[PDB]
């Protein structure tokens with residue numbers, strides 16, 4: 001198994017590096033986190049901040065989620081993140097990604113007790 005919260009950490013947390021250096025970050029990280037084993041996950045964002053900092057977003061700016069649900073939250077401060085987007089030549093199982101580093105406000109969906117992140121919605 002795997003809790004929804006655990007999956008969020010596996011799919012979106014990377015407190016080890018301050019920023020994605022070198023264009024090969026995503027190719028390695030996406031495979032490393034098992035995001036390309038069943039297929040190539042199209043888009044995925046990694047957050048380069050402490051777990052406490054990201055978890056704290058669940059008590060920050062309440063905003064509507066893209067699917068219409070009301071349990072999304074936007075970080076007050078910008079955060080260091082890395083977007084991974086699959087390229088065109090990308091063909092399973094050899095998934096290929098474009099690595100994009102940036103500093104933006106993240107938006108995550110939270111749920112449960114404790115109230116923690118379970119989905120990365122967007123960055124703005």
Ligand SMILES: O=c1ccn([C@@H]2O[C@H](CO)[C@@H](OP(=O)(O)O)[C@@H]2O)c(=O)[nH]1
Nearest residue numbers: 011043044045083118119120121122123
């Ligand atoms: O900026 C973006 C946009 C999308 N996704 C990712 O694409 C996913 C698939 O619907 C979702 O993963 P998740 O729901 O397991 O977090 C997330 O919205 C990101 O990780 N970052």
